[PDB]
Amino acid sequence: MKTEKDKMLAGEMYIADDEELVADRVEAKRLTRLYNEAVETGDERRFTLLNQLLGSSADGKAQINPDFRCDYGYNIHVGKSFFANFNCVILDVCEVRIGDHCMFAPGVHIYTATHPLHPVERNSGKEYGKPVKIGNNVWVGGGAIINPGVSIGDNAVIASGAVVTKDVPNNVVVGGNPAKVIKTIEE
Amino acid sequence: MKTEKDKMLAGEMYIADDEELVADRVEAKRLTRLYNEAVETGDERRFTLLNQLLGSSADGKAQINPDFRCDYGYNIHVGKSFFANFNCVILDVCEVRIGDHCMFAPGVHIYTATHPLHPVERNSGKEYGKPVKIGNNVWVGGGAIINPGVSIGDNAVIASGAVVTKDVPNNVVVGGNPAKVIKTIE
Amino acid sequence: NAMKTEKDKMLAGEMYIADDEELVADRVEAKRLTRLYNEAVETGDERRFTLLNQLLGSSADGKAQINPDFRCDYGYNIHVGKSFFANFNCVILDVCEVRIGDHCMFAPGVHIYTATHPLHPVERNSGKEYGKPVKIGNNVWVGGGAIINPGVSIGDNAVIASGAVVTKDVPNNVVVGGNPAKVIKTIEE
């Protein structure tokens, strides 16, 4: 009864080469190529293309620099005034929810996709994911990595190069690998 | 009386969506795309395109692998025999000065662009930058990040994965996140 | 010696002139073919495998699954086992041999470097550089954005955490993470 896609979204083990998911991934790549060319050449149709790619954006005017990459596109949901700089990658096998006024520097990667640590299970043709949630007014610094299952609170700032393995509270700066609070933001 | 571009270059808060700055970024992207195509296909005209993109290079023969990315292009200035490997990104809202014989491994990022720490100000449509300066004979290792306002001395070596958050003296190797001196070069 | 070329020295891990014409021509060809390959996989064309099998030195099953935009120096120094998978934007600098076993998977932004340079400026600026080969065992999972440096071997069943920077050999059956990469725990099966 459950499709592989149902399992995927639920965070359960799913067959990555399921017919439907494969078609979704190849379609995401084709559309993504068109989008990246639109934004590189500065065509206004970049917004229409992006709005077909992303699951949703609050204002339909998400500003994403090239070359953007994502797995499905449709699991990505952004608030108002979303900005991502060059070469961001979002593996949205599970939901990636991003709030308002969020800002990604270049090379930010968000992963929801993951695998079993044990070889037989990892090699079985099945994998899984954990959703990522990012609050309002989050600034993610250059080259940062947001790992699966992570939530980032409102007004948090992720230092460049940070590797985020655990939830980030409201109003802090985190930095390092693994990322740790390096400062509290007052107000 | 200062234009938004004037403010940007001086390290002051500027409106990023100023019509002049938007036009410059649109132009840089369009030209960067042609340049990347030229270097990917191995056409000799890659140099003439690159020389229209960068602010200056000492020998007009900078060697930059695809896909290169920059904000403006014109704020980047390189010495002779400049080399950058695959996928380098330079956010040049402020000056990026690079000396002679510098080489970047793949995925090196240089940032001058930055933002206020508090949300209201960060979300106000204004941001700022701090220039980056790199000396002569610098080797920047793969995936290293050079943050805004940093200066790197002559003959410095940045280990791969380094996250450079403060000035680096001459003749050292730095590594880690944040980067720290790990060796003196003699 | 008698007919040893710069390419021979490069492969042997010896100092070699990077701008030797044969090597320059090989890199130019790799970039040109990489561009076609990346378009093929982006557009979902079946011939992506045909092109990839001309780019890589070898793959055990001729069906390596490599996402765009892949980058490499030569292509022909890369050899992968069965069921190889690399996610978006992986870079392999294969001036020396890069040998990868069966069922390996790279997350996005994995970089493997065999190319390196002298630490002292005069020698580094001399137009010569060198490499050290990389070997990766079976069932290795390399996490997003990880760096594998020159001369590194990674054992069977090892997993590399996202963001790890691997400077030394990784033994079989460990999870490593951090910069520099250190053992997090062991894995058995």
Coordinates of C-alpha atoms in Angstrom, one line a residue:
Chain A
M1 CA 0.0 0.0 0.0
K2 CA 2.8 2.5 0.9
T3 CA 4.8 3.7 -2.1
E4 CA 8.6 4.0 -1.8
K5 CA 8.0 7.7 -2.0
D6 CA 5.7 7.5 1.0
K7 CA 8.4 5.7 2.9
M8 CA 11.0 8.2 1.9
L9 CA 9.0 11.2 3.1
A10 CA 8.2 9.4 6.3
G11 CA 11.9 8.9 7.1
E12 CA 11.8 5.2 6.5
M13 CA 14.0 2.9 4.5
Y14 CA 13.0 3.3 0.8
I15 CA 14.2 1.9 -2.5
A16 CA 16.2 4.8 -4.1
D17 CA 15.8 3.3 -7.6
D18 CA 12.0 3.1 -7.3
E19 CA 10.6 4.0 -10.7
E20 CA 8.7 7.1 -9.5
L21 CA 11.6 8.5 -7.5
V22 CA 14.0 8.0 -10.3
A23 CA 11.7 9.9 -12.7
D24 CA 11.4 12.7 -10.1
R25 CA 15.2 12.9 -9.8
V26 CA 15.9 13.0 -13.5
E27 CA 13.1 15.6 -13.9
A28 CA 14.6 17.7 -11.1
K29 CA 18.0 17.7 -12.8
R30 CA 16.6 18.7 -16.2
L31 CA 14.6 21.6 -14.7
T32 CA 17.6 22.6 -12.5
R33 CA 19.8 22.9 -15.6
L34 CA 17.2 25.2 -17.2
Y35 CA 17.0 27.3 -14.0
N36 CA 20.8 27.7 -13.6
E37 CA 21.1 28.8 -17.2
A38 CA 18.2 31.3 -16.7
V39 CA 19.9 32.8 -13.6
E40 CA 23.4 32.9 -15.2
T41 CA 22.1 34.7 -18.3
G42 CA 19.9 37.0 -16.2
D43 CA 16.5 36.0 -17.7
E44 CA 13.4 37.0 -15.8
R45 CA 11.9 33.5 -16.4
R46 CA 14.3 32.3 -13.7
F47 CA 11.5 32.9 -11.2
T48 CA 8.9 30.9 -13.1
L49 CA 11.4 28.0 -13.4
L50 CA 12.3 28.1 -9.8
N51 CA 8.7 28.1 -8.7
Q52 CA 8.2 24.9 -10.6
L53 CA 11.3 23.4 -9.0
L54 CA 10.9 24.3 -5.3
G55 CA 8.0 22.8 -3.2
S56 CA 7.0 26.3 -2.3
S57 CA 8.2 29.8 -1.5
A58 CA 6.3 32.4 0.4
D59 CA 6.7 35.2 -2.1
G60 CA 7.6 33.4 -5.4
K61 CA 10.8 35.5 -5.5
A62 CA 13.4 33.3 -3.9
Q63 CA 16.9 34.5 -5.1
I64 CA 19.2 31.6 -5.8
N65 CA 22.6 31.9 -7.5
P66 CA 24.1 29.3 -9.8
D67 CA 24.7 26.4 -9.9
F68 CA 22.0 25.2 -7.6
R69 CA 21.5 21.5 -7.1
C70 CA 18.8 19.5 -5.4
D71 CA 17.4 16.0 -5.4
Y72 CA 13.7 16.5 -5.9
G73 CA 13.1 20.2 -5.5
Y74 CA 9.5 19.7 -4.3
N75 CA 10.6 18.9 -0.7
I76 CA 12.1 22.3 -0.3
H77 CA 9.9 25.0 1.3
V78 CA 11.2 28.5 1.9
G79 CA 9.7 31.7 3.5
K80 CA 9.8 35.2 2.3
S81 CA 13.0 36.8 0.8
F82 CA 15.0 33.6 0.6
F83 CA 18.6 34.1 -0.6
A84 CA 21.2 31.5 -1.5
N85 CA 24.6 32.4 -3.0
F86 CA 26.7 30.4 -5.4
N87 CA 26.8 26.6 -5.6
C88 CA 24.4 25.6 -2.8
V89 CA 23.2 21.9 -2.7
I90 CA 20.0 20.8 -1.0
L91 CA 19.4 17.0 -0.8
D92 CA 15.7 17.1 0.0
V93 CA 14.8 13.4 0.2
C94 CA 12.9 14.6 3.3
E95 CA 11.3 18.0 4.0
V96 CA 13.6 20.9 4.1
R97 CA 11.6 23.8 5.8
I98 CA 13.2 27.2 5.7
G99 CA 11.7 30.3 7.4
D100 CA 11.6 34.0 6.4
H101 CA 14.6 36.2 5.6
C102 CA 17.1 33.3 5.5
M103 CA 20.4 33.8 3.8
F104 CA 22.9 31.1 2.6
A105 CA 26.4 32.1 1.7
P106 CA 28.2 30.2 -1.1
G107 CA 28.7 26.4 -1.0
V108 CA 26.2 25.8 1.8
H109 CA 25.0 22.2 1.8
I110 CA 21.8 20.9 3.5
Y111 CA 21.6 17.1 3.7
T112 CA 18.4 15.2 4.6
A113 CA 19.7 12.0 2.9
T114 CA 21.6 9.5 4.9
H115 CA 22.6 5.8 5.0
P116 CA 23.0 2.9 7.4
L117 CA 26.5 2.7 9.0
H118 CA 26.7 -1.1 8.3
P119 CA 27.8 -2.2 4.8
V120 CA 25.1 -4.9 4.0
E121 CA 22.2 -2.5 4.9
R122 CA 23.9 0.4 3.2
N123 CA 24.5 -1.6 0.0
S124 CA 20.9 -3.0 -0.1
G125 CA 19.6 -0.4 -2.5
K126 CA 17.6 1.2 0.3
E127 CA 18.4 4.4 2.2
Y128 CA 16.6 7.0 4.3
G129 CA 16.5 10.6 5.4
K130 CA 15.6 12.9 8.3
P131 CA 13.9 16.3 7.7
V132 CA 15.7 19.6 8.3
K133 CA 14.1 22.7 9.7
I134 CA 15.5 26.2 9.7
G135 CA 13.8 29.1 11.5
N136 CA 13.5 32.8 10.6
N137 CA 16.3 35.3 10.1
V138 CA 19.0 32.5 9.8
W139 CA 22.3 33.4 8.2
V140 CA 24.2 30.3 7.1
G141 CA 27.9 31.1 6.4
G142 CA 30.0 29.9 3.5
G143 CA 30.7 26.3 3.0
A144 CA 28.7 25.3 6.1
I145 CA 27.1 21.8 6.3
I146 CA 23.7 21.2 7.8
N147 CA 23.3 17.5 8.5
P148 CA 20.1 15.4 8.5
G149 CA 17.6 15.8 11.3
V150 CA 19.0 19.2 12.4
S151 CA 16.8 22.1 13.4
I152 CA 18.1 25.7 13.5
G153 CA 16.3 28.2 15.7
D154 CA 15.4 31.8 14.9
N155 CA 18.1 34.4 14.4
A156 CA 20.8 31.8 14.6
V157 CA 24.1 32.5 12.7
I158 CA 26.2 29.7 11.3
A159 CA 29.9 30.6 10.9
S160 CA 31.5 29.8 7.6
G161 CA 32.8 26.3 7.4
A162 CA 30.7 25.1 10.4
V163 CA 29.6 21.5 10.3
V164 CA 26.3 21.3 12.1
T165 CA 25.5 17.9 13.6
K166 CA 23.0 19.0 16.3
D167 CA 20.1 21.3 16.8
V168 CA 21.0 25.0 17.0
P169 CA 19.1 27.1 19.6
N170 CA 17.6 30.5 18.9
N171 CA 19.9 33.6 18.9
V172 CA 23.3 32.0 18.9
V173 CA 26.4 31.9 16.7
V174 CA 27.8 28.4 16.2
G175 CA 31.1 27.5 14.6
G176 CA 33.6 24.7 14.1
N177 CA 33.5 21.0 13.3
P178 CA 31.4 19.8 15.1
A179 CA 29.7 23.2 15.4
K180 CA 29.4 24.6 18.9
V181 CA 27.9 27.8 20.4
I182 CA 30.6 30.5 20.2
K183 CA 28.4 33.4 21.1
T184 CA 24.9 34.5 22.3
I185 CA 23.1 37.2 20.3
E186 CA 21.3 39.7 22.6
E187 CA 17.9 40.7 21.2
Chain B
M1 CA 27.4 62.4 -1.4
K2 CA 28.2 58.7 -2.0
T3 CA 26.8 56.2 -4.4
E4 CA 25.9 52.8 -2.9
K5 CA 28.8 51.4 -4.9
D6 CA 31.1 54.0 -3.3
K7 CA 29.9 52.8 0.1
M8 CA 30.4 49.1 -0.8
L9 CA 34.0 49.6 -1.8
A10 CA 34.8 51.6 1.3
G11 CA 33.5 48.8 3.6
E12 CA 30.4 50.7 4.6
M13 CA 26.8 49.5 4.7
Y14 CA 25.4 49.6 1.2
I15 CA 22.1 48.7 -0.5
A16 CA 22.9 45.5 -2.3
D17 CA 20.0 45.9 -4.7
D18 CA 21.2 49.3 -5.9
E19 CA 20.5 49.5 -9.6
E20 CA 24.2 50.0 -10.5
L21 CA 25.3 47.0 -8.3
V22 CA 22.5 44.8 -9.6
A23 CA 23.6 45.6 -13.2
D24 CA 27.2 44.9 -12.4
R25 CA 26.4 41.5 -10.9
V26 CA 24.1 40.5 -13.8
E27 CA 27.0 41.4 -16.2
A28 CA 29.6 39.5 -14.2
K29 CA 27.4 36.4 -14.3
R30 CA 26.8 36.6 -18.0
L31 CA 30.5 37.1 -18.7
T32 CA 31.5 34.4 -16.2
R33 CA 29.3 31.9 -18.1
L34 CA 31.1 32.6 -21.4
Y35 CA 34.5 32.4 -19.7
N36 CA 33.7 29.0 -18.1
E37 CA 32.5 27.8 -21.4
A38 CA 35.7 29.0 -23.0
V39 CA 38.0 27.3 -20.5
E40 CA 35.9 24.1 -20.5
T41 CA 36.2 23.8 -24.2
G42 CA 39.8 24.9 -24.2
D43 CA 39.5 27.9 -26.5
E44 CA 42.4 30.4 -26.6
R45 CA 39.8 33.3 -26.2
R46 CA 39.4 32.3 -22.5
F47 CA 42.2 34.8 -21.7
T48 CA 40.6 37.7 -23.5
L49 CA 37.3 36.9 -21.7
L50 CA 39.0 36.6 -18.3
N51 CA 40.8 39.9 -18.8
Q52 CA 37.4 41.5 -19.3
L53 CA 36.2 39.9 -16.1
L54 CA 39.0 40.4 -13.5
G55 CA 40.0 43.9 -12.3
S56 CA 43.6 43.2 -13.4
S57 CA 46.2 40.6 -13.7
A58 CA 49.9 41.3 -14.0
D59 CA 50.5 39.2 -17.1
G60 CA 47.0 38.8 -18.7
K61 CA 47.4 35.0 -18.4
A62 CA 45.7 34.0 -15.2
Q63 CA 45.0 30.3 -15.3
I64 CA 41.5 29.7 -13.8
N65 CA 39.7 26.3 -14.1
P66 CA 35.9 25.9 -14.4
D67 CA 33.5 26.8 -13.0
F68 CA 34.8 30.0 -11.6
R69 CA 32.3 32.3 -9.7
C70 CA 32.6 35.9 -8.6
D71 CA 30.3 38.8 -7.6
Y72 CA 31.7 41.7 -9.6
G73 CA 35.0 40.5 -11.1
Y74 CA 36.4 44.0 -11.2
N75 CA 37.5 44.0 -7.5
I76 CA 39.8 41.0 -8.1
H77 CA 43.4 41.8 -8.8
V78 CA 46.1 39.2 -9.3
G79 CA 49.9 39.1 -9.8
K80 CA 51.7 37.1 -12.3
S81 CA 51.3 33.4 -12.9
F82 CA 48.0 33.2 -11.0
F83 CA 46.5 29.7 -10.8
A84 CA 43.1 28.5 -9.5
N85 CA 41.9 25.0 -9.8
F86 CA 38.3 23.8 -10.2
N87 CA 35.3 25.6 -8.7
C88 CA 36.8 28.6 -7.0
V89 CA 34.5 31.3 -5.7
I90 CA 35.5 34.9 -4.9
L91 CA 33.0 37.2 -3.4
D92 CA 34.6 40.5 -4.3
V93 CA 32.3 43.1 -2.9
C94 CA 35.5 44.7 -1.6
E95 CA 39.0 44.5 -3.1
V96 CA 40.6 41.2 -3.3
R97 CA 44.4 41.6 -3.9
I98 CA 46.5 38.6 -4.7
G99 CA 50.2 38.7 -5.3
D100 CA 52.5 36.8 -7.7
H101 CA 52.8 33.0 -8.0
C102 CA 49.7 32.3 -6.0
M103 CA 47.9 29.0 -6.5
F104 CA 44.5 27.9 -5.3
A105 CA 43.5 24.2 -5.1
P106 CA 40.0 23.2 -6.0
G107 CA 37.0 24.7 -4.1
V108 CA 38.9 27.6 -2.5
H109 CA 36.4 30.3 -1.4
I110 CA 37.4 33.9 -0.7
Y111 CA 34.8 36.1 0.9
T112 CA 34.8 39.8 1.4
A113 CA 31.1 40.0 1.8
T114 CA 29.5 39.9 5.3
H115 CA 26.5 40.9 7.3
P116 CA 25.4 42.4 10.6
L117 CA 25.1 39.9 13.5
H118 CA 21.6 41.1 14.5
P119 CA 18.5 40.3 12.4
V120 CA 16.8 43.7 11.9
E121 CA 20.0 45.2 10.5
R122 CA 20.9 42.1 8.5
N123 CA 17.4 42.0 7.0
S124 CA 17.4 45.7 6.1
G125 CA 18.6 45.4 2.5
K126 CA 22.1 46.7 3.5
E127 CA 25.3 44.7 4.0
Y128 CA 29.0 45.4 3.8
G129 CA 32.4 43.9 3.2
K130 CA 36.1 43.9 4.2
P131 CA 38.9 43.5 1.7
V132 CA 41.2 40.5 1.5
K133 CA 44.9 40.6 0.8
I134 CA 47.1 37.7 -0.2
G135 CA 50.8 38.1 -0.6
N136 CA 53.3 36.4 -3.0
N137 CA 54.0 32.7 -3.3
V138 CA 50.9 31.7 -1.4
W139 CA 49.5 28.1 -1.8
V140 CA 45.9 27.8 -0.7
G141 CA 44.9 24.2 -0.2
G142 CA 41.7 22.5 -1.4
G143 CA 38.3 23.6 0.1
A144 CA 40.0 26.3 2.2
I145 CA 37.9 29.3 3.2
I146 CA 39.4 32.9 3.5
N147 CA 37.1 35.1 5.5
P148 CA 36.5 38.9 5.1
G149 CA 39.2 41.3 6.2
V150 CA 41.9 38.6 6.3
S151 CA 45.5 39.2 5.1
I152 CA 47.8 36.4 4.3
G153 CA 51.6 36.9 4.2
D154 CA 54.2 35.9 1.7
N155 CA 55.1 32.2 1.2
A156 CA 52.2 31.1 3.5
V157 CA 50.7 27.7 3.0
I158 CA 47.0 27.1 3.8
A159 CA 46.2 23.4 4.4
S160 CA 43.2 21.9 2.7
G161 CA 40.0 22.3 4.7
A162 CA 41.5 25.3 6.6
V163 CA 39.0 28.0 7.7
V164 CA 41.0 31.2 7.9
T165 CA 39.4 33.6 10.3
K166 CA 42.4 35.9 11.1
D167 CA 45.6 37.2 9.5
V168 CA 48.3 34.7 8.6
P169 CA 51.9 35.7 8.9
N170 CA 54.7 35.2 6.3
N171 CA 56.3 31.8 6.1
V172 CA 53.9 29.6 8.0
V173 CA 51.6 26.7 7.3
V174 CA 48.1 27.1 8.9
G175 CA 45.4 24.4 9.2
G176 CA 42.2 23.5 11.0
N177 CA 39.0 25.4 11.8
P178 CA 39.7 28.0 12.9
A179 CA 43.1 27.9 11.2
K180 CA 46.2 27.9 13.4
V181 CA 49.9 27.9 12.7
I182 CA 51.0 24.3 12.5
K183 CA 54.5 24.8 11.1
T184 CA 57.1 27.5 10.3
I185 CA 58.7 27.4 6.9
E186 CA 62.4 28.1 6.8
Chain C
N1 CA 65.1 6.9 -19.8
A2 CA 65.7 6.4 -22.4
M3 CA 62.2 7.4 -23.5
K4 CA 60.8 8.4 -20.1
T5 CA 58.4 11.4 -20.3
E6 CA 57.0 13.8 -17.8
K7 CA 53.8 11.7 -17.8
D8 CA 55.9 8.7 -16.6
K9 CA 57.4 10.7 -13.8
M10 CA 53.9 12.1 -12.8
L11 CA 52.5 8.6 -12.5
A12 CA 55.5 7.4 -10.5
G13 CA 54.9 10.1 -7.9
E14 CA 58.1 12.0 -9.0
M15 CA 58.5 15.7 -9.6
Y16 CA 57.1 16.4 -13.1
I17 CA 56.7 19.5 -15.3
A18 CA 53.0 20.2 -15.2
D19 CA 53.0 22.2 -18.5
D20 CA 54.6 19.4 -20.5
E21 CA 52.6 19.5 -23.7
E22 CA 51.3 15.9 -23.5
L23 CA 50.0 16.5 -20.0
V24 CA 48.4 19.9 -20.9
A25 CA 46.7 18.2 -23.9
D26 CA 45.4 15.4 -21.7
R27 CA 43.9 17.9 -19.2
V28 CA 42.3 19.9 -22.0
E29 CA 40.8 16.7 -23.4
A30 CA 39.5 15.6 -20.0
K31 CA 37.8 19.0 -19.5
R32 CA 36.2 18.8 -22.9
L33 CA 34.9 15.3 -22.3
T34 CA 33.8 16.1 -18.7
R35 CA 31.7 18.9 -20.1
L36 CA 29.9 16.5 -22.5
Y37 CA 29.5 13.9 -19.7
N38 CA 28.0 16.5 -17.3
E39 CA 25.5 17.6 -19.9
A40 CA 24.6 14.0 -20.6
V41 CA 23.9 13.2 -16.9
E42 CA 22.1 16.5 -16.4
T43 CA 19.7 15.9 -19.3
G44 CA 19.3 12.2 -18.3
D45 CA 20.6 10.7 -21.6
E46 CA 21.5 7.0 -21.6
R47 CA 24.8 7.8 -23.4
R48 CA 26.1 9.3 -20.2
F49 CA 27.6 5.8 -19.5
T50 CA 29.3 5.7 -22.9
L51 CA 31.0 9.1 -22.2
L52 CA 31.9 8.2 -18.7
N53 CA 33.5 5.0 -19.8
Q54 CA 35.8 7.0 -22.1
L55 CA 36.6 9.4 -19.3
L56 CA 37.5 7.1 -16.3
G57 CA 40.5 4.8 -16.5
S58 CA 38.1 1.9 -15.6
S59 CA 35.0 0.8 -13.9
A60 CA 34.2 -2.8 -13.0
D61 CA 30.6 -2.7 -14.4
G62 CA 30.7 0.2 -16.8
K63 CA 27.7 1.7 -15.0
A64 CA 29.3 4.1 -12.4
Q65 CA 26.6 6.6 -11.3
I66 CA 28.2 10.1 -11.1
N67 CA 26.1 13.3 -10.6
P68 CA 26.9 16.7 -12.2
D69 CA 29.1 18.6 -12.3
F70 CA 31.9 16.0 -11.9
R71 CA 35.5 17.4 -12.3
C72 CA 38.8 15.6 -12.9
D73 CA 42.3 16.3 -14.0
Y74 CA 42.9 13.4 -16.4
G75 CA 40.1 10.9 -15.9
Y76 CA 42.3 8.0 -16.9
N77 CA 43.9 7.6 -13.5
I78 CA 40.6 6.9 -11.8
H79 CA 39.5 3.3 -11.4
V80 CA 36.3 2.3 -9.6
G81 CA 34.8 -1.0 -8.6
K82 CA 31.2 -2.2 -9.0
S83 CA 28.2 0.1 -8.2
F84 CA 30.2 3.3 -7.8
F85 CA 28.1 6.3 -6.8
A86 CA 29.1 10.0 -6.5
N87 CA 26.7 12.7 -5.7
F88 CA 26.7 16.4 -6.9
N89 CA 29.9 18.3 -7.5
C90 CA 32.6 15.8 -6.7
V91 CA 36.2 16.6 -7.7
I92 CA 39.0 14.0 -8.2
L93 CA 42.5 15.4 -8.9
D94 CA 44.0 12.2 -10.4
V95 CA 47.6 13.2 -11.3
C96 CA 48.4 9.8 -9.6
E97 CA 46.2 6.7 -9.5
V98 CA 42.9 6.9 -7.6
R99 CA 41.8 3.4 -6.9
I100 CA 38.3 2.9 -5.5
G101 CA 36.7 -0.5 -4.6
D102 CA 33.2 -1.9 -4.9
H103 CA 30.0 -0.3 -3.6
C104 CA 31.6 3.0 -2.7
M105 CA 29.5 6.1 -2.4
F106 CA 30.5 9.7 -2.3
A107 CA 28.1 12.3 -0.9
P108 CA 28.0 15.8 -2.5
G109 CA 31.2 17.9 -2.7
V110 CA 33.7 15.1 -2.0
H111 CA 37.2 16.1 -3.1
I112 CA 39.9 13.5 -3.6
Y113 CA 43.4 15.0 -4.2
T114 CA 46.5 13.2 -5.4
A115 CA 48.2 16.4 -6.5
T116 CA 50.5 18.3 -4.2
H117 CA 53.4 20.8 -4.1
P118 CA 56.7 21.5 -2.3
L119 CA 56.3 23.5 0.9
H120 CA 59.1 25.9 0.0
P121 CA 58.3 28.7 -2.5
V122 CA 61.2 28.4 -4.9
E123 CA 60.6 24.7 -5.6
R124 CA 56.8 25.1 -5.6
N125 CA 57.2 27.9 -8.2
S126 CA 59.6 26.0 -10.4
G127 CA 57.0 24.6 -12.8
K128 CA 57.3 21.1 -11.2
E129 CA 54.9 19.4 -8.8
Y130 CA 54.1 15.8 -7.8
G131 CA 51.5 13.5 -6.6
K132 CA 50.8 10.6 -4.2
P133 CA 48.1 8.0 -5.1
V134 CA 44.9 7.4 -3.2
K135 CA 43.4 4.0 -2.4
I136 CA 39.8 3.5 -1.2
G137 CA 38.6 0.0 -0.1
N138 CA 35.2 -1.7 -0.6
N139 CA 32.0 -0.5 0.9
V140 CA 33.3 3.0 1.8
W141 CA 30.8 5.8 2.4
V142 CA 32.5 9.3 2.1
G143 CA 30.3 12.0 3.6
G144 CA 29.4 15.3 2.2
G145 CA 32.2 17.8 1.6
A146 CA 34.8 15.5 2.9
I147 CA 38.4 15.9 1.8
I148 CA 40.7 13.0 1.0
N149 CA 44.4 14.2 0.8
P150 CA 47.2 12.7 -1.3
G151 CA 48.8 9.4 -0.3
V152 CA 45.8 8.3 1.9
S153 CA 44.4 4.8 2.0
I154 CA 41.0 4.1 3.3
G155 CA 40.1 0.6 4.5
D156 CA 37.1 -1.5 3.7
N157 CA 33.8 -0.6 5.3
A158 CA 35.1 2.7 6.6
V159 CA 32.7 5.6 6.8
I160 CA 33.8 9.2 6.6
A161 CA 31.6 11.8 8.3
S162 CA 30.5 14.8 6.4
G163 CA 33.0 17.7 6.5
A164 CA 35.9 15.3 7.5
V165 CA 39.4 16.2 6.4
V166 CA 41.4 13.0 6.0
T167 CA 45.1 13.5 6.3
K168 CA 46.2 10.0 7.3
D169 CA 45.4 6.4 6.4
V170 CA 42.0 5.3 7.7
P171 CA 41.8 1.6 8.9
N172 CA 39.0 -0.7 7.9
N173 CA 35.7 -0.7 9.8
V174 CA 35.8 2.7 11.5
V175 CA 33.7 5.9 11.4
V176 CA 36.0 8.9 11.3
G177 CA 35.2 12.6 11.5
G178 CA 36.6 16.1 12.2
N179 CA 39.6 18.1 10.9
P180 CA 41.9 16.3 11.1
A181 CA 39.8 13.1 10.8
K182 CA 39.8 10.9 14.0
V183 CA 38.1 7.7 14.8
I184 CA 34.6 8.1 16.2
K185 CA 33.7 4.5 16.6
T186 CA 34.1 1.0 15.0
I187 CA 31.6 -0.8 12.8
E188 CA 31.3 -4.6 12.6
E189 CA 29.2 -7.0 10.5

